[PDB]
Amino acid sequence: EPLDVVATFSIIGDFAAKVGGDRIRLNVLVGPDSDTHVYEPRPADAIALAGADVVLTNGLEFEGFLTRLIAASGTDAAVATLTDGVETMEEPGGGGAHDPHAWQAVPNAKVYVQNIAAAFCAADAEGCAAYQANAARYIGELDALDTEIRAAIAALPQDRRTVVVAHNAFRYFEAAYGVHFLSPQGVSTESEAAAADVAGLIREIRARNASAIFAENISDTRLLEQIAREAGLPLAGTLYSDALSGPDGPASNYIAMMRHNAGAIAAALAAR
């Protein structure tokens, strides 16, 4: 009777719970504090897909395992790519690959949400008015959030807008909001460290007068702690990049995740 939905990872799982309410049964593959770039699907994940009516995915090559997992599971679920209709950004490096981290700009989260609603509308026409009224309610909360983030940032001094994080995961926040981010890893956490290039990072840190270093919830902290040491900059806290916190963390849903991040960034930038 309820719609069987599978979401690839936590951030889009939260969006699904918002649009779908009581009418869906939700399963999430990659969970809180876990990293989708390196996730290897387990056999339990194939069982989940096999029963789904709807599978929700970021797309943009975020989930390198999906298409395999789809064929292994034999699922007939319809698959919705929630970045459909988002203004995407190309990866810096490559490779006409796209940067998958589109949810870091709240306007794009509105789109993910619209696509969830459409997907549920296609699978359960009887529920469609309810899916859309949930989406519209939530989209109103996202619009207020967007306003608050832009406002807080645009206030801050033009000359102190840079922070250091773990991977290159906030380019859409930069584009929406005007905060510049450096990191030792690229767009994906698949690679390494090339501690052979912290001295490169550090030099860019000095040239840009970066205000602070942040850990990320998906990643181990040691290099960040060391970069902090060598740059003489505080380790200011933890940002939530590609996953929610668990419950009882400060980022257990998307809106809370963004308010945390934006508040932590602003405090650090204003510290100087």
Binding mask 55-94 for Zn ion (x = CB under 5 A): ----------------------------------------
- For 270, residues 6+ apart whose C-beta sits below 8 A from its C-beta are 156, 160
- Closer Cβ to Zn ion, 114 or 241, answer by number: 241
- Closer Cβ to Zn ion, 160 or 167, answer by number: 167
37 is in an annotated binding site: yes
Q: Is residue 219 classed as helix, strand or coil in its secondary structure?
A: coil
101 is in an annotated binding site: yes
Interaction of residue 169 with Zn ion, rule CB under 5 A: yes
Q: In this structure, what token pair is assigned to residue 235?
A: 């380790």
167 is in an annotated binding site: yes
Q: Is residue 156 classed as helix, strand or coil in its secondary structure?
A: coil
What is the C-alpha to C-alpha distance for residues 223 and 249, in angstroms, rounded to an integer? 23
Q: How far is the CB of 62 from Zn ion (least distance, A)?
A: 8
Q: How far is the CB of 78 from Zn ion (least distance, A)?
A: 26
- Closer Cβ to Zn ion, 131 or 240, answer by number: 240
Q: How many CB atoms lie within 10 A of CB 245?
A: 19
Q: How far is the CB of 216 from Zn ion (least distance, A)?
A: 9
Please count the residues of the chain.
272
Interaction of residue 242 with Zn ion, rule CB under 5 A: yes
What is the C-alpha to C-alpha distance for residues 258 and 215, in angstroms, rounded to an integer? 15
Interaction of residue 243 with Zn ion, rule CB under 5 A: no
- Closer Cβ to Zn ion, 169 or 228, answer by number: 169
Q: Which stretch binds Zn ion (CB under 5 A): 69-77, 147-155, 164-172, 221-229?
A: 164-172
Please return the burial class of 127, using the count of CB atoms within 10 Å of its CB with bins 0-12, 13-18 and 19+: buried
Interaction of residue 54 with Zn ion, rule CB under 5 A: no
- Residue 3 host element (H or E): strand 3-9
In the 3-class helix/strand/coil scheme, how is 148-176 assigned residue by residue?
HHHHHHHHCCCCCCEEECCCCCCHHHHHH
Task: Please report, as ranges, the residues that interact with Zn ion according to CB under 5 A.
Answer: 169, 242
- The annotation places the binding site for Zn(2+) at 37, 101, 167, 242
